[model samples]
Target: KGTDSLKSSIEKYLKDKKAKVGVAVLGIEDNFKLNVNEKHHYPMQSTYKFHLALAVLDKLDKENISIDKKLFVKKSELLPNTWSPLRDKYPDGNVDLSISEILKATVSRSDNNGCDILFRFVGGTNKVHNFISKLGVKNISIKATEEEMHKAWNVQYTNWTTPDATVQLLKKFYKNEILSKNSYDYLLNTMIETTTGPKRLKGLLPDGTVVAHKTGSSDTNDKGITAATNDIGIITLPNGKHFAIAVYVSDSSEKSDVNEKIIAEICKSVWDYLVKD
Candidate 1:
């Protein structure tokens, strides 16, 4: 009965948005959950990098590779046509960075170049997919670098996941079923420090609420249609309970602000129900 009202509110909030939206929320302790269009495949965009990071950390743990181990990145590797905070920091680019540093750049800053570098480290996108498959997550597909995805109009769509699958992966990660404790904590910290999409899921939550999230975005096409705007994360409730949430807004003709607000509103709605006494 409680969730019925919450579901109605979520549907009402999204009724007017001119976009294909997928949402999934699950309370880890209470087993309360909700899904709307959760089976529809939506372009993951940068969200695929979260899977990549998990794979990299898994491989490193398997090989006993130190997180502090150094890796070299060259200037030429900073491909154009994507977002890369790493490139902006090192314009002429050839820098020696640790595995941990690169992971932070990739996850927290959503750095494109940093992501590809991690992809290469773990032997590419196929390897990442294999790793995720090993975790038993289904209805998911991942197969492109950020550079390749950005090169064509439809390439990004090649890498996608159902919102249900997204939440499944998050649940796996949160339960420590996917990565070693050291690696898991490292990635979780990076997500909490994420610097992007301040106006999305974490936007309307109360201040000081811990939301460890990853965000994905795509520029509007010439026709003003946006392919994807997404945020998925674990949110800690006031009473110390937690939940995993995923929201994807796809094929939208609205402004970026409006697209992000849709996600914010959905998160706030769920939060209101989640924290209710």
Candidate 2:
């Protein structure tokens, strides 16, 4: 799609949804961004898991570290609002799991505890930023913190990315520019496990549409809101044209309805726009 067409689509979708800010990009061929908010630094929520996993793999590859290597978790590693088998109350809170399982937990469930543990094991969140920097994704950076942000803004130095930059990361992953195919495939499989993003993009498409995606959400209390949402990934239409899209919403009053509408309409608009081509 041309630049003008992309912009028009984005504006229409955002207008239709009554959203304060929205960003979308079609990156299958090259980076073609729509109506983007240039100044906004989106809270990554859990979507940063994608890159976190990649950074872990890079470390493993460099050090001949096998995914099967296990790391024991201490009581200090437990965090709230995560889905992990290793609860603080477990008998073996110190029990170890392979790096592969940790990655799966991070991606599959968007598990906060898994992410915190891996973030530390990989030598802090900067490692993910370092990997992305080596790949030349300029608009993203990891803000270091001692713990997850929900605990306190100071403790959780979380990953942050602009909407456009998120799409670029997806494009590189899809094009196999950022990691080996094995590593890329690993990320893709993890994306398929995403449960949260379906509310928007998947709501508009037919059943069984292939959407490899990741969704992020920020705590309402931390930022004086209930939910901040972001999702970005590849969409394969029935006709075989591939599109890369990212949707981010910050400080929403009604997260479920607003988010669903933004994603569905943007995709519906694109599908309608592309039908003639």
Candidate 3:
């Protein structure tokens, strides 16, 4: 199927959903570009970890901070109500972790405590906002921390990004233009090693597929609405070519599994189209 038909095929999977969704896919060296509601601002749950990782690493490099330097994670910061692999590991929370270790926990595991810690280490929300904005990317906001988002159901909406802007930022990062080579490599590997959202981007792909991605999700609300269910990243084709894709399912009342399948099916269809040639 050509681009036009490919779009219709993808749309068939989206139109029935009871949510606002946006998608954008860009082939690094190919003419395949797809966008459906690409400009709509979608809430970013933990996906902001990807951006935080970039900001933290960039600061370390620019300020000559050693990656091996250890930072203290106080036990009190590990709130019992949130998801945190760091807390799971330390349980007590007074342990000190290297910068690299904290970063891995934050990005790969989506550790909420580690996320807020990195935010503190890097100078908080505006630091990441300014970093990405300085890269010339647009239509994105980073305003709240995990703690803040957990305090209220609506705070998650403060951190949002459009589908097209996501791909644009990912493209800029993938090109190794903005970050130091070390920072770029570290962030890329961190995303590639990400352990969250397996059933989203990598859901229906072949085994051993190399998709360096980030995922974000929100708790289902009292009205049964899920404010955000998102995944964005680069898919490494069999020939070593890469295509970045972003899918955001926002304000959805669908079953969580159904929400994730929307992402998987789109990736699978795009995979089929990209490989058939």
Candidate 4:
């Protein structure tokens, strides 16, 4: 009964915007939840980086790799044509950065080069998927790196996840049951400091609300449709309770701002219901 209005509000929001949206929200305390098209697969874009970080941390924990372990990244490996804050910061490239720094670039900055670099360290895309599968997360598939995805438009479809599965990943990561304390805390703090998508899920939340989130975006196609605009994260409530939320907007013909606004509005609507007495 408590979720009825919340569901209606979400439905109206999607319909009014004429957008293809999928959302999953779960209360951390009671496991109360809501899902709209949560089972459908949507292109994850950079949102897969969150899980990539988890997989990498898991490997590091097993291998006893130090967070400060240094890895060399060559200039040529930076790859061309993708979102890479790391490359932007170091145009000359050919630098050695610590594990923690690479993780920050990958998760916090959504650096495409950092993402592929991590993929190389842990084997490849399949290794990341294997690690996630071992964690028992289902209904998700990751088959391409940022480089591969950008090289061919069709390759983006290879990495996909359901909204429900995305939220489930968040829940496990937040509970400290999936990763070691050090690794978990590092990833969590990086997500909190994420420099991308400030206007999506965290866009409309009240000031001082702590939202640790990851965002994914796609360049508008020749047809002017955006394939994926997404944000998934854990939002802290006033009472100290938090909720794991995932909002994916796919195949949207609207402008980027409007598409992001759809996610922001949905997040605010859910926040109002969640904090209601």
lDDT of 4 by residue, 1-277 (tens): 5698789878877886656899999877768689997758899999999999998999899999899989989999887677787888887878988989889999999989999999998999998888888888898899998888887778887899999888889998998989899999999999998667889998898998999999998877899889999999999999999999999999888889999999999999999998884
List the candidate numbers ranked by lDDT, top first: 1, 4, 3, 2
- How many clashes would you count in candidate 2? 4
Instruction: Give lDDT: candidate 1, residue 116.
Output: 95
Per-residue lDDT tens digits for candidate 1, residues 138-221, read 877988998888788999899999998888899889988888899999999999987788999989999998998899998799
> Residue 203 in candidate 3 has what lDDT?
97
Q: Rank the candidates by TM-score, best first.
A: 4, 1, 3, 2
Q: Write the residue-wise lDDT of candidate 3 on 100-125 in tens digits.
A: 99999888889899999999999989
**What tens digits encode model 2's per-residue C-alpha lDDT throughout 1-277?**
4667667657755664434455756648644456466567666667777778878877776787777888888865765446565463453466777788778777877777788788888888777788888887887868653254666643322456777777777787788876666767777887776776677667778788888887776655543453457777888767776778777776565556666677676666766655455
Instruction: Give the root-mean-square deviation of each candidate in angstroms.
Output: 1.3, 3.1, 1.5, 1.2
Candidate 4 deviant stretches above 4 angstroms: none
Better structure of 3 and 4 per TM-score: 4
Candidate 1 vs candidate 3: the TM-score winner is 1
- Return the TM-score for each candidate structure: 0.96, 0.85, 0.95, 0.97
At residue 136, what lDDT does model 2 achieve? 77
Single out the weakest 10-residue window by summed lDDT for candidate 2.
Answer: 150-159
TM-score of 3: 0.95
lDDT of each: 0.90, 0.69, 0.89, 0.89
